[PDB]
Every structure is written in C-alpha cells, then in structure tokens.
Symmetry: C7
Subunit: 261 residues, 7 copies
C-alpha cells in the first residue's frame, strides 16, 4: 500500500470526476442561458433548439475528452477528428460568412444607398434595403430581386443616379441623298430649341458612319438624370416630325438587284 | 526484481488492457444505442448499417491507438493519416454541408414562400416546398424541378409575386406614314377604357424608336399581379382591332430595290 | 557498469525490437486477412494486389517510424511528409468521394426513381439505375449516358413524370387579314372536341403577339403525362385541316418591296 | 569532472553521430536498391536519376535534422518548412493523382470497353485502350485523341453501342398544299417495305410542326445499332424517290412580296 | 497534510485566479482604449460596438482557456475549434483582403492615374479616384462605376491616354467599278490636306479586301490623343463629300437574280 | 553560488552561442557553395543573387530561432508565421510546379513527339520541342505558340499524324432535278479513277440530306495522311469538271416568290 | 520561505521581464533599421510607415506572448489565432505572389523579348517591357495594355515574329462560269511575278470549295515576316486588276427566283 503513487492516482481520478461533473453543470447552465437569451428576442423554435443541442453536444464532448485526458487516455486522434469536422463546417459556412463580410463592407463604404437606381452585374433596379446577407431591389418592371452581398462586392457596381447629369445618344439613319449640312443644321436647331438639354455641356452632332442602307449621324447631349427619358422621347419625336416636314426620308433596307434572262 | 519500475510497467500494461476493453464495450453499447435510435425513426437499413459500421470502426481505432500510446508505441503518424482522412471526408461533404447551411438560411430569412411564383437563376416556377437540402418547384409547363439550396443562395432570387403590382410593356410597330398623334391618342383611349390598368401609376405612351421597317411605340402600364397576362392579351387584341378599324397598318418587312438592266 | 541507465537503454532497445517484430507480424496477418476477404467477394486481381501492397507499406512505415521514435530518433519530419502525402491523396480522392456522397443523398431523398423520365442539366432520358458513383439513363434516341452523381446533385433536376398532368402550348401564325374571333372560335371548337384535354384545367386561346409576317395565337391546354405527344400531334393536324377547310391561310414570309427606276 | 551529466552528454553526441552515420549508409543502400529496381524494368535514365536524387536528398535531410534534434537544436521551423514544401508538392500532383484515381475507377466500373464507340464530353470515337492516366480513342475521321481520365469521370459518358437498338429520326419538309394523309400513307408504306426497321418498336409518322415555308413531318423508327446509318440513307433516298414519283414537292424558301409603285 | 504537493496545488489555483482576473481587467482596459480610439476618428457606432464586442469575447476566451489549462483541464479540442473558426474567418475575408492588396499594388505601381481615361476588362471611363478597396470611374455616358481592385489587378488594364498619339482606321466600301488609283489618290489628297494628321507617322491607304457588295479600302492615320474623334469625323465627312463630288458611289447591298418562268 | 543550476544555465547559454555561431558559418559556407555551383553552369546574376539571399535569410532565421529556443524564449508563434509564409509560397508556386509535373508526364508517356502535327485544345501546329515547363509549336501559318504543359495535360490532345490513314469528306450540293443514280455513278467513277484513295477502306457515296436549295450528297474516302489535302483538292476539282461536263448544276440559293397586286 | 521553488519563480519572472524588455528594444532597433533602409531607396511614405507599423506590431506580439509563456500563461489559442491570420494573409497575397513567380519564369525562359510583336490570350501588341508583376505592350492601334504575368503564363503565348517567314492566305471568290485552269494560271503568273514571295516554299493555288454564290480558290504563299502585309496588299490589288482585265468577274450574292401568279 504505497502512499505517494496511489494518492496521486486518487487525485487524478477525483480530478477527472470533478472535471466531468463541472463540465456537465456548465453545459446545462450555458444551455439554459442561451435558451433564455433566444427567448428574449426573435428566433425560430426549431433552429434555436438545434443550435442549443449542437453547442451542448460540443461542450459535453469537450469535457468528456478532457476527463479522458486527465485519466490518461490519449485523445489526440479524437482531437484530429474534431479539427477535421470544424474545418468541414468552416468550408461549408465560407459562403455565408463571405456574404456577411461583403454586407458589412457595403454598409461601411456605401457604394449605393436605399432608393438609388443601380445596376449590379446584369440586374438593374431601385434598391429597397440592404440586410446583413443580401440586398433587395425592385426592377422597373416591378419585380423583386434578392442579391447576396458577396456577388455584389465581386464585380462592378454601376450607379446610375450618383451623377446628376447623364448623356443621351441618338443614332439617326437617313438616305445617302440627304444633304449633310441641312441634316446637321436641323438637328442643331432641334437641340437649341430644347431647354432641358444642358447648353454648357458638349452637344455633338456629327456624321458617325456610312451604313449599308443609310448614313448614320450621332447626336450626343447631356441632361439632368431625372429627365433623361423624357428628353430622349421629345427629341426623337421632334426629329421625326422635322425630317418628315423637311423631306428627309429614313430609308428602308436598300437592295441593288441585277436581272439575268 | 525491482519494485518501482516493474510495478510501473505492470500498471501501464493493465491500464492499456483496461482502456482497450472499456473501448470495446463502449463501442458496442454506442452501436446498440445508435441502432435502437435509428429503428425508432425512419431510416434505410443499408445506410443505417453503413453508418453504424463506420462509427464502430472509428471508435475501435480510437481505443486501439490509445492503448498503443499507453503501452508506449508512438501513434503520431497514425494520427496524421487519420487527420488526412478526416480532411478528405470534410472536403467531400463540403457540398452537402453548404447546401444544408443554405437551406437553413432560406428558412430563416424567407426570401420566398411556398406557393410563390419565383425565378431562380434561369428557372421560374411556383415553389412547392423547401427541404433541408433542396427545394421543389413546379413550372408553368407542369414540370417538377429540384434545386439544391446552395445554388439558390448563390446568385439572384427573382420574386415575381412579392410586389402586388407589375408593369406591362407593349411594343407597337406601325408604318412611317401613320400619324403620330393619332396613334398616341388611340393608344391613350384604349388605356383609359381599361379598368384593370391602374390610373394612379404612370401610363407611358411614347414613340420609342425608329426601326428598319416601322416606327416603334412604347406602351407601359401597371396592373395587379394576378391580372397581368389577361390585361396584356386584352390590350393587345384591342390595339389590333382599333388599328385595323382606324386604318393604321402594321407594316411587313420593307425593302427598297433598284433595278439594273 | 551502471545498473539504472544501462538497464533503461536495454529496455528501450528490446521494446523497439518487440515493436518492429510485432508490427511486421501484424502487417502480414492483416494482409492475409484482407486478401482472404477480397477473395471471398468480387474483386480485380491487379487492384486488390495494389491495395494490399499499399496498406502493407503503410503499416510497415508506421511500425518502422514507431521503432525509430522508441530508439530515440525524432521522426517529426517523416510525420510531416506523411501528412503531406495523405493530404495529397485526400485532394485527389475528393472528386470520387463527393460522387459517393452525392449518390448516397440521391438514394436517400429519392429525387428521381428508376424508369422515370427526367432531365439532368441538359441531358434527358429514362433512368435505368443508380449506382454508388454514377447513374445510367437511356435517352429517347436510344443512347446510354452515365452521369456522375456529384454533377447530378449540383444544379437542377427536372423530373418530367412526377406530375401526372402537363401543359401543351401551340403557336399558330396566321395572316393579318384573318378574323380574330373566327380563329378563336375554331380553336375553341377543336379544343372542346378533344376528349384527352382536361376540361377542368385552364384552356387558354388568346392572341399572343403580332409577328413580322403573321399574328401569333397561343393555345395552352393540359393533358395526362402519358398522352401529351399524341395530344399535340392530333391538335396540330386538326388545326391545319380546319384552317385549310375554313380558308385561314398560314402566311409565308411577307415582304414589301418598292421599285426605283 | 562530473560523471553523470558529462556522460549523458557523451551518450547524446555519440548517439547523434551514430544516427547520422546510419542515416547516410541507409540512404546509400536504398538509393542502390532503387537504382537496381529501376534498371530491372523500363525507366528513363534522366527521370530515374532525378527520382533517386530527390529521395536521397529527402532521406539525408531527415537524418541530418534528426541528428540536430538529438544534439539539442530545435528543428521545428525546419519541420514547418518541409511540411509546406510537401503540401506544395501535393497540390502540384493533385491533378495527376486525380487522373490516376479516375483511371482506376474507369477500370473498375467499366463504363466503356475497348473498341466501343462512345462520346466523352464533345468528342466521339472508338476507344482503343485505357491507360493509368489517360485513354486513347480514334475518331471516325481517323484522328487520335488522348483524353485524361479525370475529365472523363467528370461529366457524362455517352455510350453509343451499349444499346443494340437505336432510333432514327427523319424531318421531312413538304409544301402546305400536299395531302397530309397521302404523305402519311406513303411514309408508312416506305417504313413497312423496310426489313431492317424493327416492327415491334414504335414507328412514329406524324405531322410535327408548321414551318415558315413547309409543313414538317416526323418519322421515328428503330433499328439495330450496326445498320442505323444505312437504314437512314436508304429511307432518305426512298422517300425522295417516292415523293418525286408521287408529285410531292419539297418547297424552296417561300416568300410573299407586295409591290408598291 | 503534505507541505509540498498541496502548496504546489495552492500555487496553481492562485495563479489561475490571478490569470483570469488579470485577463478580465486587460480585456476591459483594451476595450476602453479601442472605444476611445474609434471615438477619436470617424467610425460607425454599430460596427465599432460589434468590433469591440468581438475582440472582448476573443480575449476573455483566451484568458478563460488559459486559466483552465493552468488548473489542469486540457483545452486542445477548444484550441482546435478556435483554429477552425479562425480559418473560416480567414477564408471569408480572403476576398476583401485580396482587394486591399490589389489596391496597394495599384497605388504603388501606378498603372493608371486619376483623370485618366482607361478600360478595365470591358468597362471604359475616366478614373475619378482610387480607394483602399475599389476605384471609381465615370463613363463617357456619365455613369458611375465602382470596380473592386482585385478584378482590376486580374486581367488586362487598357490605358487609352498613356500614349499621346493614337491611330485611326477608316473602312471605305466602294463599288467594284470605281477606279482604284483614283480612289487612292483622292484619299491621299484628303489625308495630305489634314493638318492634325501626323505626317511623320505611316499613312496607310491601301485596298484591304474584296467584300460581297463592295471593295474595301483601309485608311490608317495617326493623330494626337486629344483630337482623334474630331479627326475621324472630319476625315469621314470630307471623304463622303469628295466621293459624292467625284462620282464615286458607295454601293447598296448588291444582288444578282435569275428568273425562272 | 549554486553549482548545479548555475552550471546548467552556463551550459545553456554557451550551447546557444555555439548554435548561432555554427549556424552563421554554415549559412556562409552553403551560400558560397551555392554561388560556386551556379557559377559552374548557366544562371542569371540577379536571380542567382536573389536565390542565395533568400536561402541565407532562411538559414539565419532557422539558427536564430533555434538559439532563442535553447535560451528559453518560446518561438511557437514565429514557427506559425513561418509555416504560413511557406504555405503562401507553396500556393504561389502551385502553378509552376503543376506545369513541371505535367511536362514530366508528357516526356514519360509520349502522347506526341517532336515534329508531329497535333491540336492542343484549339491550337494546331507541328511540335518543335518540349521543355520542362512549356512546349513550342509552329502553326501552319508560321506562327510560334508556347503552351504551358499543365493545360496540355488538362483536356484532350488531338494527334493528327499518329494514324497513317485519315478520311476525307465531301459535301456536294446539287439541284433537286438532278438524277440521283447518275450523280452517284459519276462520283463512284471519280473515286475509282483516283489511285491515292484506299480501295480496301469504305468508300461512302450516299445522298446525305435534303437541304433548303439543294440535295446534299456525302462522299467519304480514306487516304494516306501525307496526301489528304492533295486528294481533297484533286477530287473537288475533278467533281466540278465532271459535273460541268455532264450538265449537273450546283444550284444558287433558291427562292419561291408570290406576287400581290 | 523556501529557497528552491521561490528562487525558481524569481528566475522565471526576471527572465520574462528580460525577454519583454529585449523584445521591445529589438523591435525598436529593427524598426529604425527598416526605416533607414527604406529611406536609402525609393519608397512611399504611407506604405513604408504601414509596413514598419505592421512589422513592429508583429514583433511586439511575439515577445509579449513569449513573456506570457515564460510566466506560465498558455498561449496556444493565441498561436492558433495568429496562424489563422497568417493563412488569411497568405491566401490574400496568393495572387500577387503567383504574378511574381510568373514574372520570374518569363524572365528566365524568355518566351518573348522586348520589342517583339506577340499575342497573349486575345490581345496582340509589341512588348515594351516586362516588370516583376506585369508586362506592358503597345497595340498596333497605339493603346497601352498592362498584363499581369500570371495570366500570361497561364494559356498560350503566340509569338508572331519568332519565325522570320510567315504564310499568307488569299480567298478568291469567282463566278461558277469562270475557267478553272485560266484562273489558276493567272494566279500562278501573279505569284511568279512577285519577288518578295519565297520560291522554295510551297505556293498553293487550288480550288478550295464551292460556295453559295461563287467558287472559292485558296492561294497560300510564304514571305518574310517584315513584308507580309505589303505582300498581301500587292497580291490582292494585282489579282483584282488582272481579273478585271481578263474578264473574270467576282460575283455578287446570287439568287434564283421563281414567279407565282
């Protein structure tokens, strides 16, 4: 009956039992605290129960393997398996965490605001709100699109309404017989008569190219962002009316045919 | 016959034997408990047996290498191999775990509900149900599509029926000789006569562009989500009837030919 | 001639020799057991021999480095190299393991069954069987396609025959001079005369759009899944016969030509 | 002159020298054994020499750092660097190892055999042989394609000759004036006169659609895999001859023109 | 009542209590310091509070597990879980960190400057500013685009205004009957009359190809970057005027028709 | 003045100083040896100096942290940082190492040889040489393409000249009025008159399809690889001459027009 | 008042204080040295200050946790967090490091030189210089493109000017009535009259195909790299002149029309 080694072993076993008992009570208390906190705010019953069960299982596994290590059982392989499981969970949650970080960045740097008409990688609409994981926008068609923030941060973010002034472009295709200077002066008169077109900005009216069936002119004018569509429609209808009155004819697809027999 | 070192070795070997025996009985008991639990609920026989065999093999490997470590055999390489295998399994299960996390997020944030007509990255249909891993939707054609939740969370989620009001768009192509104001007033009268078109929303009737063979007008009106298709059909048929009665002719593809010889 | 340290060294060397000898016999016995088990069931000779050789090499390396560690040679670098090799093997087997997990999920959740006509990401066919790694389907052409389960789980799974009722769609292009109400009533009579078209489902017969050379009507009717193709063919032939009898003419590509000189 | 600590240090230095000397002789002997084994079979001189040099360098590094650790120099950073290098090599060899695993799977499950005409993700040809890393197929053009097995396992594997019976499809475009029943009965007579067309399989002869310039019929018949092309050619030529004899005319692209001025 | 082991245990427990108390006060002090520093500069209240809470939780977890380790509870599994969480966070923040590094590189090497018209992988505009994470450019249309720096560093960066001289290219399509030397000399005279075209640079005027309906000439001239568009427009209008005066006719799409019956 | 612990500390400090001094001299000697070896063969001065500096810095860091560990400073965090840096370097060099492994595989298995006309994923040319990292080929146009070996190993490798015999295919489009048997016999006579066409291989001359404006025949013949282009040209010119002599007319795009008004 | 354990604790605390003080002075001295070195060469003030701050923070964290470990506080979790941060930084810098390695390889193997006209994955231009991270090329248009070296190493590198001789190809489309031998002899005479066309290289003049409206000949000739464009232009203009003189007519798009009513 040794008094040193046996007492050391008794200390080890009592310490292991204390460790496991304290771990059990700690897991129970933290489970109760988490349940109370989740009750204190909005939460789903099923998801909250799953979360509490998962954290309880984790803590009881921790204390069980700690007691095993104190007893003398090597738990290095169990630690390796737990690390592998944690890495698997991290890889699984990589996407959601990346979306969360992207949402944080979007909140911080404010590339776009609520109620701001923007285009995000092929989808354009007025932003309603930005959440932690994904934004919500309403298209001009009236559809609702929910875009995760990670793919928003990736790629360009076109902000339409950041600049108060935007430029219109008109492609006018008239017949080759039309008088170049006459067309240019008619277009210039139309541009001058318009009050919503900025006068200090460049007003480009030039012959752009020679198409297959027509000669294409380019008309580039700037206007306020909130009036661009109306300016475009007004200038287009005015151009059509003026060309019809002045005899300028928009040509149909031309063709040159040669007869055989 | 030493009394300290030999007794220490005897303690080590007896402890190793106790560890392996306890590990075997623990593996057997946990296997029985898992089998009973899987019997208590719905499970496949083959899959349940494979799962029980895998967990049994894992636990017996744990206790065997623990006994080896207690005896004195270094098991660091075995731990390295087991960690590599765990990492391989984690990488393999990354996709399924990501789908599970995405499904949890879809349940939580509720981007779309059951019975809600939505479009998910090129496929549109009415959602039937959302499971842990994948959703199910029925297309308007009547087909069933099962979409994993990970690729739903990735990319945009178009929700058609979230907004009660959606906008229609009509592209009317009439001949260049038609009277612009007459066409506009006919379209406006048609829009006014329609009761299902919202009057407080913007009712756009403008000349949109000058096409190759026709002048294109744009007609944009809003209506309730549940009547959009009928409104479109009614307005289209009414437009055709009114243009036929009023003499406005939709032009066939025009061509200008010039003869040689 | 010391009696403590030298005896400790003798214990160490004898223990190392015992460890390596036991490792060799254990490797031989497990190799024999694996060979016997592989003989007891279906296996390839070359692949089984390679597997047995690989596991034998692994076990002998384990016991050799364990003996080195017991002797006193540090094997941490060898453990690092073995861990790197295990990680490389895990990355290599990631694809096959992912396919296995996907196959397990396909068995469990049963998105599609054997003999069920489905479309899987661009390939459509009747499923023959689902294996652990890949499925087999026969296309309507008669071809055999083997699809790994991972890419099945990734992306949508269109199930054609899950819903007993599917909807047909007919696009009828008639000349602009045709009477809208006459065409609609002829189509409605044809739909009513058909017994295989469900009457309780919506039977849509509306003017869909105004094409370049014709006005397009939309005919949407539902029918049983096993009769959809025959219903389509019958309705199409009936429509052609009725339009030919009633004088409704399907227009050829129209063109409007204007002569110069 | 202490007798315990100094003797311990002498033991340490002698053990380190023994370790390094034994490591050198072991590296030399294993290098000789590897060289002899590579001589005993087919190998490249340059590649074999590089492999032997690499393994020799690895073993000498192992024994050198082991001697350093025995002396008392901590080699944890060296172990970290070696682990990083091993991980880099594993990532580099991931592709080749994945190809090897894919080849093993292809050998095991036998999705396709030698001399079997298959299509593998856009390339179709008769398989010549399957190696450890890549297969070889000959296209019908006579070209040789070497396909790595990893990208074969990824994606679908279309096996043309697995099913002894395949289905042909004929798209016949005849003028709108042609008699539907007459065309159907002529096609049916042609199908019946053919002996290589399976009679127990479905023989589909229906009006498929109404094209822009013609009405398209669908003819679907099954035949043996080794006669499909000849059956197609024979049926096509027979159809042309019968339609020419019976007056059925395949229409050229139709056009409806309207004159102005 | 032992005096060595019990005193050692008392030292351990007192040291653990000291460690946890010092950890708590250190966490509180560093939280106060971080809050003060964030108050001293621009910061969001919510984000700053979340950051302080996260760092406080991290530090208290560190000191709690340190106290557990001092007491004697093994915390290796907790360390494994914390390492997995850290790896998950690192993978999540990989994108933002890559953008930060790319922005640093863009600042250092200066591929483009503010106010410099450039094209970045499909989007072209004048750069306004470069931030830590993303740049801002204004397109010629007037739109604002925010581009993350990582995708700028990836792929090419076209710098339009780095070179003071750029080359124009004119594609002139004239009828086959036109005189080649006459067209060449007219184009050369037009090029010579232009003062904004560099004379020391190559002035290419050659017959480029034989098109379907015309023979295409290539005109390549260099000019200053700030005058390229005006030079193009002037040369184009001058070419049209000179060809109209000289009788050179730009041909409409030719066609050769042959009559049957 | 203790004689045990103080002497132990003196041993520790002297051992640390010896370790650092030996590390410095070893780093210097290995740097000199590496510089001499790089001088003995072809090397760049800048790259060699950078490599020597990097290895010197690595070795001095190793010995410095080893001396710190011997003194008693824990260097685990430094080891963690060094491991992270090594992993970063491994990820950076992954691409180059993968190219090296792919080049080794290409040398070993010999999918293609020097001077062998092959196509490698969209680029076709005659291979000049294969290096450790990338190959070089000359296209038929005369251009030089350098292809990294990794993307060669990935994807298919089309070897044109591996098979001595390749098959030609001729698509002949003749008018619908032409006599099928007459065309077939003319083509067969042309095929028979050709001596470079293999007679034992299948010589396919069949009516392939019914095109929009012509009936398409398929002519498939085999020939030696070194004469395929000349055989194609000769057969094509012979076919044109024979059809022109025999009255068979290749039809221009047909059109059927119907007049209105 | 014990004299062994208390003196050991005093040694530990004094050693910890010495470690932290030495760490602080070492961090300060290395910060001063780094600042001096960065002053001695070109550097940005902001970036240099950030780098010095980062390295100072790293070193002070190292020494602080070392002092904690010496005192007795376990810092394993802190080491885990630092390792996670290092891995995150490594993943972030992976792209830049890969670009650096690719640039080193480009310098070493010299796939292309400065002033060498090459095409790099869709962009072609004359290379100006190659830096550590990215190259710079000027397109023939005069634009400047900066290409990171990683995407240069990935994918093919087309080197236009490596081969002194390149081959031209001319596609000549003449009417079906033209005499084949006459066209061939005219083309051959044109090829012979050209002195810049290599005579020892193959001069291919054959009928290539039968197009919809013309018969296409292929003309393939080789020339020096620095004269290819001029040779092409000269041969093209000569061909047009000779065909116009000899009566050979390049046909316009043919059409065969058939009249109804």
């Amino acid at each position: 009956a040794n008094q040193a080694l046996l007492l050391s072993y008794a200390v080890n076993i009592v310490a292991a039992l204390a460790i496991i008992i304290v771990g059990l009570i700690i897991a129970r208390m933290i489970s109760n605290a988490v349940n109370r906190l989740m009750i204190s705010r909005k939460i789903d019953a099923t998801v909250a129960d799953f979360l509490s069960a998962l954290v309880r299982y984790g803590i009881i596994a921790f204390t069980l393997i700690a007691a095993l290590g104190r007893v003398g059982v090597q738990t290095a392989s169990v630690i390796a398996v737990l690390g592998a499981a944690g890495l698997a969970v991290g890889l699984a949650l990589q996407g959601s965490l990346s979306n969360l970080a992207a949402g944080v960045l979007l909140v911080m740097f404010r590339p776009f605001r609520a109620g701001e008409y923007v285009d995000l990688g092929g989808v354009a609409g007025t932003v309603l709100s930005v959440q932690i994981f994904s934004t919500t926008m309403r298209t001009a068609d009236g559809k609702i699109i929910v875009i995760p923030n990670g793919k928003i941060i990736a790629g360009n973010i076109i902000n339409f309404s950041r600049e108060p002034v935007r430029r219109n472009e008109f492609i006018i295709g008239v017949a080759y017989d039309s008088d170049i200077d006459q067309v240019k002066q008619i277009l210039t008169n139309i541009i001058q008569s318009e009050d919503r077109i900025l006068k200090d900005r460049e007003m480009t009216v030039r012959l752009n190219e020679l198409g297959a069936s027509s000669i294409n002119f380019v008309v580039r004018v700037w206007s306020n962002s909130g009036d661009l569509q109306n300016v475009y429609w007004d200038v287009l209808e005015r151009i059509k009316r003026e060309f019809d009155a002045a005899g300028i004819s928009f040509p149909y697809p031309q063709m040159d045919v040669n007869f055989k027999r």
